[PDB]
Each structure stands twice: as structure tokens, then as C-alpha cells.
Ligand binder design. Structure first.
Ligand SMILES: C/C=C(/N=C/c1c(COP(=O)(O)O)cnc(C)c1O)C(=O)O
Ligand SMILES: C/C=C(/N=C/c1c(COP(=O)(O)O)cnc(C)c1O)C(=O)O
Ligand code: MET
Lengths: 387, 386, 384, 387
């Protein structure tokens, strides 16, 4: 079996004009040979292109690379992770349907599900998905979808994807998994029973902090077609230049993820033993509740996780005296990022959800990059040891 | 008194690092000076950026440009015209609401309004908006929006935006106008009483056929904030490179439109007097129904219009023996495009709606570019003789 | 007219794409050893490596080639790359070059500092007078190099007459037509052997690319230019070639407006009490207007005018609200510059005085803004 | 000391408008605050920009990154490696000067030294620089420069850079080293006594096969200013978009080089023991003449090297039956490339030099990428074992 490293460096498809790098198709439209050839293409007959919103070759190349690592029937690229999320939910859910989603999600996902979905007649419950019994108890005759992020952003809370998939499969609901925090190198939700696996490509997949994009991959040709049907009318598109950048970033994904994983674990162990640190929420630590599930269902760990300081003032002093780590939101970049969830990424999450997400002013989230790990640790140590 | 040409060439804003051209901010995220500065930005306090989905300086520069020409409170850029349309309607409409839309729309707009909105519990009636009394008859107690394209894609049917706007003001509904076909140089819906004016930037505004993008502009600060709030969660973004290209394309918009207008008018009159053409639907032709409303409510015409051949075989013969004109969907590019609506742009629209639209296999849609008009006329002339 | 040709360039579409794709690649794949071997020998159609040939760059080359009436065109990383490749590709130790006495600053630097280190004799002379060219002639003269109208004074040379001397005496005529664009000046049509532009200016026209292009009358000459380029390495990036081809789609239309704006602004300045003199080739008062009207089909919109003092020039340049103080020219928006202390600051004083550049001169590059807005901007800054 | 990985991820300089990624300054010109402020910049007084040919912020950012790894006084970026070579030689050499260069060089470098320099009255001798005594024997009172590639493209012939530097330093000649084949992670010519270190950035530094570019770094402020002065008139510029891509590719250079080095050595050892293979020219092999100099003067190896088949026909059979390796010129890409020097990269080298260079139709050059090394070896092995 050929390694993922090789597969990503050797994607299927013909070269264009013998070009070694896949060209950037910075075009809106495509030319027809004849009236029939164009008419046929609109009916889905024959091979070729019409218009970049419907399909663009550079973007299609990136989709195939994601499709190849997910083990999907197809993938669809979007202008952002939120585009991928919207199109993976609202492509299926309609007025009268019920959605069960995790109670700890990325802020804008909470916004989508709690503000917009109810305006469209869609019933939503945010449930603690780390407990399958609670998922079952929240199930209704009109439940059509379960949506999970695991490990959750930012607390790393682990859900049992495999166990929840069984219930979805017995009861006719789609299981959708946002695997952004871990990357398709370490978490393949379609192998665990999910119907759709999505990512903010803005994070690890692209990895270079210079594009915003989303991707969604479906187990079934019918589901990926419906997703693309929705995309056509909702209009969240990956730009050709951004697809070129994302495919390029993804060429180094496996080796970056190996370094991220090892760095993140070493940084978490350093913090876990440090006097100033109260707790570390990294799912690769044995102290972490849900570690046994993460270890079974994933083949590695991302490097973004959260830790607890003794006070808000101590969190502030740390985050503001770092020379290698950069104070900024986002994650999964080659360089190390740090932020304060309570006042930043999750300052917009309703208080009812803040308290049961478990997010407090003492928490700091770090996204460990691929810098030499000793340099990252020395940077944290010097700020922790300040006068 | 400063001319539109000058305004687009001299946008408001500081230069970045003294750079003459506005830099391409190809970044996802922005750095914070301190915990407080970041927390302040998340609360809308102070000046600065956080993350490109919330706001990107290169994108914002293009948004300001469009906002200037529309006379808007603010503008929002998107990944596509369909992103602008989705975000300008579903940002406001919710379950139990009712939408009145023109019956002749771009194909994917029909798919949006006919397939997705009713799945979200939104009631939708497609009606002939060229007659204001028909809009009034279709009105219900829960009508929250009227959505228009004028001149319509592809038949160029004209609606009285100004009169429909009065009805909307009186009865508590938003008026949303898709002005893609005409461009903001010639049609300014917000000056006519609309609440929202939107464009597929993919067409005239960019004008170079190398970008897909959308833009929407709102009369009020509250409405554009709502649109951007929807965009934050729906995620149709204009990429920084595409915003760089759209702004650059828009620098020549006024001169390009002037040529497009004059070129398209001349080509339509050539066709209108040719023996093989049954009729030409150009809103600037005296013969066109609705010409009188278009000359009053617009300050010029786009150059995309349709004309009728005697049969499908004739249309097929014309479209396939052109040497300058390119057989392709889309419009508003620098070069001339030509298309068969029945089996291309409007192939997926249900028979029911399509016959209401008056779209038949005998119609050909041309998008006249900025070539020497004589080369376009001679191309058509050559082909019409075979 | 020219617009149709630029919008419909020859060649096949790639994957049916309407816009020509950006080949952001260094290398190309071979079907077999033989096919690679053949390509390196110039046999068969195809590509090897972007420095030898990139499809996106070649499409832009083809566009310029068509408008110039050339055997071929080569694109470069800057106008200076085009200039140095159109000269040092041909000149060698022992050769003599005659160049116009008034040239862009870096061209003077190239001809004055570098060429003589390579053993190439160079004299700068007044090429507005053909007898001076004949008098500077030597038995080893292999090239005459010209800018017309010259940067920044707009000094006009008789290109056709000089070409005649060159053809008779066995020298190449190379012409930098940056200031006018190939819409209005076609040197190869006037007898010149090579015609070149800084694409950074009018051709691209959007102020967001630096690039150069050179076009030769003969297949041999362009092949030599590209062979030099292969080793010297001033290439146009695929992205910049995409942007230049895109900018060039509006070239004939932008030029029409530049020309008209520039002529209206120049006449306004010419009759303004505060202005000593205006150096625009299209004015009747300008010396050599007759040659420029004969040999060109229009004018660019960059020209020089004289103020009554340095303090007055500084006051004008620093109270403008539309015009931007910046070097460069041929952008869609208006630019203004002080030659003596900016573009031409490094020029040796003796070449400087022979050029006629003083601290009282201001150089304007008139954009495509509404003319009345440009004039009203100049008006308030001169009067207030 | 902070690690190179960390340095490259954390370059000196302020952020622009708080942007995390450095913006692409796709501009030709820059604005002046006043006549004086503009005048001053032209005189080298004050901080700021004039015009991209003179300096572009995105390009300067990439230059700073190279400068930091080379340990130089400054770096200059170009539109190609050939731009860097032309500008690092012809910026200093004039009519009457003598240049000693290696006899095994990149083909277009031979073309430059052999066709263009003599036309400019510069005397040139190509010498076997693997023998310091041959360098001394070729020295003349007017020798001003020695120019070396080591390991040479394509034969990997090693020169004693340290030993030749001694001679240059005693006699008033600049030593210039093209370190393209090894990358600045493993070869730092300025630490060995060179005056100038240059690269085709097209190869390893950028690493993604999608940019052509060059860079030159000088030990002395004066020499880098002279290089940039030449560049300003000769006009080989790195485009802003290309500088953005090179800086981005360079963010992963140390980890890519680590994998290239290990992959290349394992592939070389596999070929060395294979019955079909006559000889393997990889400088990290103990069998290689000059291995001892290479291991003392470098801190690793690039992964581009050459091997000898039994015949031209066997070389063609191998090259044309690979599924992972790609038949193309260039090198230093994330994916594996392969080519035939005799009929491709060195087919323009005049017959006397190509004889002295030791290039025969039996030689194949491989540029080993970062694919899984077992997948690369299996691809070579299957082609070598064909019917
Ligand atoms: C291929 C597209 C065509 N039109 C598009 C279009 C859109 C949709 O805009 P994006 O395509 O999403 O940028 C919105 N509004 C109008 C009046 C339109 O014509 C076409 O007809 O040929
Ligand atoms: C800042 C630059 C100015 N000029 C440039 C120029 C070049 C050189 O072109 P690159 O700059 O190398 O593309 C060549 N030829 C002419 C007549 C030029 O004006 C300027 O004057 O303001
Ligand atoms: C003359 S082909 C140039 C490509 C590259 N320098 C190589 O050796 O492969």
C-alpha cells in the first residue's frame, strides 16, 4: 500500500500542457465546441467544463487530493470552513427536521446552528456528545442529523464517533464530523462510520496561514452531488489561486502533521509538569478524560489544545511576554499561535453555552507549530518564570 | 462634482507602507498587540483586523469602491453572485415569510428561490414585475421582500423599480435589485428607492472574465451589518487575490461600460434590420416594451440582450459559424460572448416557469464586448449569409 | 482596429478555458526520453522549463509581437532587463555604441558604468540632429540606441532618418518606445531593428507590475535576444505575464484617453501665467513637433514643464489632492515627479546639463481620470 | 542558539497592518510624503521604498530569510538562478580580468562563462577544481575570481572550498560558490571562506516546482550593494508573487531537506547494490571520491545525484517505466524527478567540456523527493526488474 505522502505528491489526472505543477485556472467561463457539446455538458453528459462556480480544474485537483486521503466518493471545496459546514448541513436539513449537535463547537458553528437554522424551521439541540446515552435520550422521530467536532475546539472534549455512528445508522440519520483540529492524516471520520467529513482548510490542511477555505467529503456519490448542488446556489467557492495554494500546502501535510503531533505532545507534557499550570487538556495525555477513545479512533493528535492557569492575570502575563508564540486567533499554522478563548474566539458564545462548554478566563489555547520544540518550550518557560 | 472615473481611481483610505497599488493581504489571521486589544476588536471597539472571514483589508478596499458608486451605507463582497443573492435574501427571510420575485431570473436564482427557500419554510411567488398592479395583487400580510432583476436575464424584461419601491416602502417590505446586467455606472437601485443593490462581479464590474465574485450594497448600516453577519456563518468570501483583480478591473469600468453601451446598441440595430431576425430585445431600442421606463430609471444600457431566429436550425447555424464571438455562458467580458439560453443558462428551470419567461429554442443571447463594433457586425454578417 | 486583435489572440485554448491559464510552474514533463531530447534540439512542439519558455509568458509575447509587426518578442522581469538584453546580446569588446544624450536614468547608468567595463565604447550624442549621428560615426559603430520622445524632456529624434544611416552603414537601430506605447509608435515600421518597452508603464498600465519586452524585426535577432535571456536570467513571472496580458486588453482605449487628457492638461499649463514652458511633443510650440506628428500616430501623456523656481515646483508638487507624488509613469492615475532629485538624480552633471534637466522642472504623467478633475487639481495647487 | 526552523518561521521585521502572513506588494511604485522625503530616499537617507526594481517589501522579506540562514551581510533575490549567477560575476568582472571556474557546471553557467564573458573581454579558464594544485597552476596576475559548484551538477564532483578560499584570500580574488545542489541548510559557503553564496531558488529553497528564482548573499555590505547596483541596471527581478511563494516554500525547508537527505542516501545505497547499476555518484557514499571533503565541509547532502547504467538502452528502459518518478529536468522538488544529462540538461555543453565533465549516454540523474522512501525504491526496483 502506497504511503499517503506519495499519494498526495502524485494525484490522479492528466497534466495540462505537460505542466509539472497544475496550472491556476484563473477564469470564470469555458468555451464550447458546438451548441450540442455545451448543451450536453449542462445535462452532465461528456467530459469538460462550463463555468468555475460549477467546476474549475484547479479547484477540482485540490478536491481529488482531499477525496484520496478521506477515502470519500467525492469532495467539495468552499471559500471557508463555514461554507463547508453550512453546505454540509443546510444541503440536507429542512423545515421540520431535527439536528443533534455537540455542545462544544467552534463559535461560528454555534452561531450558525443557534441563530440561522431555527429561522429556517430546523429544530436544534446542543448535547454533550461525549456521552452516547445523552445522544440517545435527545433523539426524536424527526432526527435527521448528528453533527460532531472531536476533539472539540477549544477544550479538546472527545466524542465516541464510532458509537454515535451506530445509532445514526440504525435510525436513518446522517453523521457529520468536523475533523479540522486533527487533520485527515490522523482522523478519518468516514472510516469510523460518518457520512460526511469536513475541514476548515484554513487550519492544518493548507497549513501556511495564508488562505481561508473549507472542504467537505461524503461517503456516497449522491451526498456529494447534493452538497455541490447546494454550493452552486449558495455560492461559497474556493478561488482558483486559493486552490493552488491549498494543494501546494497539502503536499507537506503528512510531514507537518508528524512534527505538529510530536511538538504538541512534548509541549503539553512540559506544561503539565509546570508549577504555574493547573491542568492541560490535550487528548494525547493519559490524564485526559476521553484519551482512551481518542487513542482508539485516531492515529495521531493535532497540536492545538488548551491549558488552565491559576488566574486571568497569570494567563495575560504569559500570553503577552512570548517571543516565539504569536498572539492571534486561528490554528494549525507552521508557526505557533496563542489566544484567550474567553475574550476572543468564544467571547460571542451565549453564556448558557459558555458555562457548559467549560470556558473560563483562566484558560489559554496554544496551537503548536513546527518550530524546534526546545525553542517553543524555552519561550513558554521564560514567560512563566517572569518577575 | 468629481467624476466617477476619478473616484474609482482615487479610493478613500490610507496607503499601506506607502505602496501605490493596494497590497494583496493573502493571510488568514491578524496579530494582536495585547490581550485587551484583541478582546476590544472582538467587541467592535477600536480599529483593526482579526481574521479574513470577518474582514480582509484587500477585500474591504474593493467593498469601499462599490459602496462609493452605489451611494450605499456599506457593501459586502462574496465568492460569487449567488453568494451575494443568497446572503441578501436569507439574511432577512425566515420561516413563515413571503417573497415576491420577478418571473424572469438568472437560472440559479430560480433554483435558489424554487428549491431551497421553500425547504426553509419561506413562501415564494414568481410574478410579472413589469406590472406594478400585479405586484400589489400578489401581496399578502406576510410579504417581507420583493426581489427584482431589471433588465431581466436573458429577455431584458424591464420592471418599474421606482414604483415597486414606493409599494415596498408603504407596505413594509425590503426591495432587493440584482443590477448585474446594467452595472452600477448606469443603474443605481438605491437612488430609485431599493433597500439592497447587488451584482455578480463576475460580469461587467470585473469585466475581464477571470474572476467569480458577488457584491451586495445596503441603504442602511443595520442591513449591511446583517448581511455581513450572515456571511460570517454562511462563508461565501471573496478571496484576497480576486478582490485585488476586481478592484483592478473596476478601474476601467466607466470607459468599458461606455463602449459596451454604444457597441451593444449598434449591434442590436444591425440585427433588428436584418432579414433573418424576428426581433431584438434590447432595452434601448424604441421598439422594446419597457424602453420608456428603462430610459427614465437608468443612465445607460448594458450590452447583453437576446434576439430571435426563424428556427432552431438557424440559431444553431449562427452560433456555430462565428469567428470573433465565442460560444460560452457568462457575460460582461471585454470580448464578445454568445449563448443558447434554452439549453444552457436556463436549461434547468421548470417548464412552467420557462414558458412564463418566454424562452424558446429560437432565442440567442449575445454579450457585446469592447472590440471594434465593425468586427462584431462583420462576424455576425458573415455567419448570417451561409 | 487594435482592440479586436488584443482580445482575440492566436493560439488554442487550454482545457477550453476562456481566460488563458497561469502556468505557475518551473518545469514540464516529457512523454519519453526521445521527446525530451527532441525538444532540447528544437524539434517538435512543447515546453521544457520556464526560463526557456512558459506558455503564459509566450501568450503575452505573442500579443506584443502582433501590435509591433515583429518576427518575435521576448518578455523580461523589467524594462532594464529588456534594455540590457537588446544591447549586450549584440555588442562586444571593441564595438562602438551611439546613444541619445537624453535617456531614462538607469539606461544612462547602464551605458555609462557597465558597458565600458565590458570594453564597449559609448558616446552619448544629440540624436535629434541626424548630422551629429553621422559625425559621431566610427568604423567600429555597431549600434544606435534611441528613446523618442526622450525621458524626461520629450526630446524627439528622427527615427526613420537615423534608421537609413544605420542600414547604409551596417548598424542595428534599437528604440525604446516606452513613453508612447505601440498603439502610437511602431519603431520597426520606421526602419528600426529592435523596439522595446518597459511594460511597467503604459502596456500594463495598472501600476502593479514591473516588466519589460523587446521585439525584433528578424527571426535571428529575437533568437539571439532569447539566447542571452536564457543566460542573463531577467524573466517575466507567469503571474506578471497574466497581469500584463490582462492590462493590455484595455491598452488602445487607455491610450486614446491618456493622449487626449495629456494634450488638454499641457495646453492648460502652457497658458498658465505661473508656468515658464511645456515640453509636450503634440504642441505646436515644441521643437520637433513636426517629426513626431510624422513618425507617430499619437502621443503618450507623460511630459515635462518648467516652473519659475525650485520653491514654486515644490509648492505645486506638495499641494496636489488627486495627483500622487511618485516615480513611474503610464499608470491609470496621475503621477508627478521631480526629475533633478528623483528619476535623474544619479545622472553625471555633465550628461545632466546636456540633457537640460534643472531643479525648476516637474514631470507629469496624466492618467485616465476625468480631465477637468486633473486640471482643477493643478489649478488649486498653482493658485493657492 | 535558536534553531534554523524557528528562525525561518520568525523573520525579523514588523508586521504590515498586523497581518500574520507578509502581504504581497504587487506594486510597481510607492508614494512620497514630500519632495524632500523622496529626494532623501534616492540618496539612501531615511527608511522607505521608491520603486519595486530598487526594493520591494515582499522580496526584501524573502532576502532577509536567506540572509539569516547564510550568515551574510545581505542577500539579493533575482528572477532566476541564472540572474543570480550573472549578477554575482559580471557585477565585479571587467575587461582584462581573469576568472577560474569549475569544469563541471550547470549547462547554462557553462554557456554564460564560455559564450558571454569572453565577448566582454573577460578571460575564463574552466579547471578541475577538485585539485587545489590545478587551481594554483591556472592562477594569473589578473585573476580576480574563482567560481565553484560543489557538489557539481550533475556529477556531484566535490571541490575543496576551504582550501581554494585560502588561495583566493591570499591573492585578492573573490570566491563565489553556487550551493544550489545542497541548500543553505547543509552547505554554508560563507562559513568556509567564500565571499558570495548563491542559489537557484527554483530548486530546493522554494522546493515546490512552481517558481523560477535566484538569490545571492555576500559576506560584505559593499559587495551586496554592488550586486544590487548591477541588478538595478541588468533587471533580473524576483516578482512579488514569486517572492511570496519562495518565502512560503522556505518555511518548510529544514524539514524537507532532512527528508530529502535521508531519502537520497537510502535510494543511493539501494542503487549501489543493484546488479543493473554500474556506479553511483552520491557524495555521501563512502565509495565516492571526495566523500571525505564533502562530509567535513557540509552538514548534510542534497538528494540529487547521478548513476551509471550498463547502456543507453538500459537507461531509457528505466527512465520510461517509472510510475512515481517523473521524467523532467530541474531538481529539488517535493516529488521525485529523473532525467538524462547527455541528451537533456547538458546536451548543449560543447563536446570537449562534456568529455572533461565525464557525461556519457549511460548516466541517469535522479532528484529524490520527499515521498515515502520505500515507494520510491519499489518504483525503481520494478522498472529495473522488467522483462
Ligand atoms: C454563467 C452565469 C450567468 N449569469 C450569472 C448571474 C448571476 C450569478 O452570478 P455568479 O455566477 O454567481 O457570479 C447573478 N445575477 C445575474 C443577473 C446573472 O446573470 C449567465 O447568465 O451566463
Ligand atoms: C521609475 C521608472 C521610470 N522609468 C523607467 C523606464 C525604463 C525602465 O523600466 P523598468 O523600470 O526596468 O520596468 C525604460 N525605459 C524608459 C523610457 C523608462 O521610463 C521613471 O522614469 O520614472
Ligand atoms: C537547461 S534545463 C534547466 C533545469 C535545471 N537547471 C536542471 O539541471 O535540471
Amino acid at each position: 500500500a502506497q504511503d499517503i505522502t506519495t499519494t498526495l505528491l502524485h494525484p490522479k489526472g492528466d497534466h495540462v500542457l505537460h505542466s509539472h505543477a497544475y496550472p491556476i485556472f484563473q477564469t470564470s467561463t469555458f468555451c464550447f465546441d458546438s451548441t450540442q457539446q455545451g448543451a450536453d455538458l449542462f445535462m452532465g453528459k461528456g467530459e469538460g467544463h462550463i463555468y468555475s462556480r460549477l467546476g474549475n480544474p484547479t479547484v477540482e485537483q485540490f478536491e481529488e487530493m482531499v477525496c484520496s486521503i478521506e477515502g470519500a466518493a467525492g469532495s467539495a471545496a468552499f471559500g471557508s470552513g463555514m461554507g463547508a459546514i453550512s453546505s454540509s448541513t443546510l444541503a440536507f436539513l429542512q423545515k421540520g427536521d431535527h439536528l443533534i449537535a455537540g455542545d462544544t463547537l467552534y463559535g461560528c458553528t454555534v452561531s450558525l446552528f443557534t441563530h440561522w437554522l431555527p429561522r429556517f424551521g430546523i429544530e436544534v439541540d446542543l448535547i454533550d456528545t461525549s456521552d452516547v446515552e445523552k445522544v440517545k435520550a435527545a433523539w426524536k422521530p424527526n432526527t435527521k442529523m448528528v453533527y460532531l467536532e472531536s476533539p472539540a475546539n477549544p477544550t479538546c472534549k472527545v466524542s465516541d464517533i464510532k458509537g454515535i455512528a451506530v445509532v445514526c445508522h440504525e435510525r436513518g440519520a446522517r453523521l457529520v464530523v468536523d475533523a479540522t483540529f486533527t487533520s485527515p492524516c490522523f482522523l478519518k471520520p468516514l472510516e469510523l462510520g460518518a457520512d460526511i467529513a469536513l475541514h476548515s482548510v484554513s487550519k492544518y490542511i493548507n497549513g501556511h496561514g495564508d488562505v481561508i477555505g473549507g472542504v467537505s467529503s461524503a461517503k456516497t456519490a449522491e451526498d456529494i452531488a447534493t452538497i455541490k448542488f447546494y454550493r452552486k446556489d449558495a455560492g461559497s467557492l474556493m478561488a482558483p489561486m486559493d486552490a493552488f495554494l491549498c494543494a501546494r500546502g497539502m503536499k507537506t501535510l503528512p510531514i507537518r502533521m508528524q512534527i505538529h503531533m510530536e511538538n504538541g505532545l512534548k509541549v503539553a507534557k512540559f506544561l503539565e509538569q509546570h508549577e504555574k499550570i493547573v491542568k492541560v487538556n490535550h487528548p494525547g495525555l493519559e490524564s485526559f478524560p476521553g484519551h482512551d477513545i481518542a487513542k482508539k479512533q485516531m492515529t495521531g493528535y493535532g497540536s492545538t489544545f488548551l491549558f488552565e492557569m491559576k488566574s486571568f492575570e497569570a494567563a495575560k502575563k504569559l500570553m503577552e511576554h512570548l517571543k516565539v508564540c504569536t498572539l492571534a486567533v486561528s490554528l494549525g499554522c507552521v508557526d505557533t499561535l496563542i489566544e484567550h478563548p474567553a475574550s476572543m474566539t468564544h467571547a460571542a458564545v451565549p453564556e448558557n453555552i459558555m458555562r457548559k462548554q467549560g470556558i473560563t478566563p483562566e484558560l489559554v489555547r496554544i496551537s503548536v507549530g513546527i518550530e524546534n520544540v526546545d525553542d517553543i518550550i524555552a519561550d513558554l518557560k521564560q514567560a512563566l518564570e517572569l518577575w
